[PDB]
């Protein structure tokens, strides 16, 4: 008897909170437009998730970027594949320590991979290219941070199939790591979550399954590569969502201290990521906006699940 | 003291105890991970980590499983987060034996401003250093490494802190399933019992070794 009036009070409050939530962002009947990503980026956000990934493919190298293409008018290489993992992890460190003058600290990861096409003719076999999935599958894991709307690099890691083979076979004297082997022993797959497509508007209707095509383009290339059985150890090494992937990337080198580097190196690495690679502060400000918008989108689904649970209890009690 | 229908599952060597219940077709599961560093006193007055646990209440009639992050303070109960998971209580969802539950899901809004209320009384939080890599020396530990703790939202403070009139009905909705302050008074006292039995076993093992 008293369980009915409690479950109906919560279901009426969750229906009123969701009614008052959509009323705040509504502007004269028009709902809240999501923030626009930069050109070429296709954001995929799973429903009921804590993260969203966006992809970018620079054909014919980095010279097809946004900064290298703008010029003044009226007067081959390997392709680059970008992937920005952006979780909802954003916090303020001035509360725990008031000596730090930081208003916002948001972390997001960037994985950049390269793939040789069959169209380049100039530099075929002068040197064996180590960025190819056939030869080592070298990839750069640049962990970034947005420190008061300013992009700061946290770590620059260079991971190949050798580092996944070393951690699984001979990280110790004669064995692998006892914790990295144990984390590979407990790898259960996630249920398929329906992803939402907040892509760039110019590439929203061009092709839909292009990041799905480029995800299995490297997946069939690396499992059938020179390094064959070490790809399950490499996918968990490149797993950007979870604690097993962050521990596995901590077993590798993790790069040098960036503030201990030369200042000519720090400006050249910032000129490469922002200028050449295209991952700029326009994207870095967008990630914190997209972390804020999809937190609002997941709060409404959370309010819908409070109403869905509380109505299911009172109809049975 | 003990609640009405709750079995305790505790093995010596692990700093974990789990409480289970089942009323009708619904099952409510409470898991706690006792801190090894230091736990707060039951008197409260005089590094001093609070006893924070989880509550998994599963209802097959709704099709969802509610995860309730609960913190026991002075024998009472507060709730910091409520999240929803698909299906009934699978074994992988419970953080027993150092394998976590479902990761990469929405944690939920702040139901209460308890952690900001500890800032005015100058009580130190779990985040001792602002450097996240400094606390990643003791990885896979919720008390020492808050950046990978499921119970501490992996160091993230959410955007929405829920309405007081709305979040009061959510606390009353879970208290009919046995997540009241009578349960948290037992968890507060059993965590001090696990913390002493783990310490006297670790000492007597260390005596015979040397």
């Amino acid at each position: 008897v008293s369980l009915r009036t409690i479950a109906e009070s919560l279901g009426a409050a969750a229906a009123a909170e969701l009614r008052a939530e959509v009323e705040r962002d509504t502007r004269d009947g028009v709902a809240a437009i999501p923030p626009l990503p930069p050109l070429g980026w296709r954001v995929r956000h799973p429903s009921g998730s804590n993260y969203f990934v966006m992809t970018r493919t620079l054909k014919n190298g980095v010279q097809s970027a946004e900064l290298n293409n703008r010029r003044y008018r009226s007067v081959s290489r390997a392709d680059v594949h970008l992937t920005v993992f952006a979780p909802f992890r954003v916090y303020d460190p001035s509360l725990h320590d008031p000596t730090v003058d930081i208003c916002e600290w948001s972390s997001f990861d960037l994985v950049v991979q390269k793939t040789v096409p069959d169209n380049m003719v100039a530099n075929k076999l002068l040197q064996p290219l180590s960025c190819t999935p056939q030869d080592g599958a070298l990839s750069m894991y640049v962990c970034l941070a947005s420190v008061n709307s300013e992009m700061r690099i946290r770590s620059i890691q260079l991971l190949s199939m050798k580092e996944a083979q070393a951690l699984v076979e001979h990280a110790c004297f004669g064995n692998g790591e006892p914790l990295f082997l144990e984390l590979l022993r407990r790898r259960g797959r996630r249920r398929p979550l329906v992803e939402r497509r907040f892509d760039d508007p110019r590439l929203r209707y061009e092709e839909v399954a292009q990041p799905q095509q480029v995800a299995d383009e490297a997946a069939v290339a690396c499992s059938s590569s020179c390094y064959g059985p070490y790809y399950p150890a490499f996918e968990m090494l490149m797993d950007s969502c979870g604690s097993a992937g962050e521990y596995s990337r901590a077993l590798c080198y993790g790069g040098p201290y960036v503030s201990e580097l030369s200042r000519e190196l720090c400006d050249a690495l910032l000129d490469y990521i922002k200028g050449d690679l295209g991952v700029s502060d326009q994207l870095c400000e967008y990630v914190c906006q997209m972390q804020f918008f999809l937190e609002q989108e997941e709060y409404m689904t959370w309010l819908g699940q409070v109403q869905h649970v509380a109505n299911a209890v009172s109809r049975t009690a | 003291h003990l609640p009405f229908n709750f079995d305790v599952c505790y093995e010596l060597g692990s700093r974990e105890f789990t409480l289970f219940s089942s009323v009708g077709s619904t099952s409510v599961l409470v898991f706690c991970n006792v801190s090894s560093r230091r736990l707060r006193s039951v008197k409260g007055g005089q590094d001093r980590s609070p006893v924070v646990f989880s509550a998994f209440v599963s209802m097959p009639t709704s099709g969802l499983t509610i995860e309730a992050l609960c913190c026991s303070s002075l024998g009472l109960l507060v709730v910091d987060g409520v999240s929803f998971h698909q299906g009934p209580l699978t074994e992988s969802m419970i953080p027993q034996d150092a394998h976590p539950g479902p990761e990469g899901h929405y944690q939920g809004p702040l139901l209460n401003q308890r952690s900001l209320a500890e800032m005015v009384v100058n009580t130190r939080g779990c985040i001792t250093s602002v450097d996240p890599f400094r606390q990643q020396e003791s990885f896979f530990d919720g008390h020492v490494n808050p950046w990978n703790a499921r119970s501490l939202r992996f160091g993230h403070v959410p955007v929405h802190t829920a309405k007081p009139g709305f979040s009061d009905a959510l606390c009353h909705f879970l208290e009919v399933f046995g997540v009241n302050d009578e349960l948290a008074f037992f968890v507060e006292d059993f965590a001090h019992l696990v913390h002493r039995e783990e310490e006297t076993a670790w000492t007597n093992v260390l005596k015979t070794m040397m």
């Binding site: 959509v22 009921g48 409404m300 699940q305 869905h308 | 097959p60 099709g63 969802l64």
Partner: peptide, 16 residues
């Protein structure tokens, strides 16, 4: 329209 979408996504399931 959002609750219609969440039942298609599976976030609001049926009776188990």
């Amino acid at each position: 329209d959002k609750i219609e979408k969440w039942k298609a996504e599976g976030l609001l399931p049926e009776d188990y």
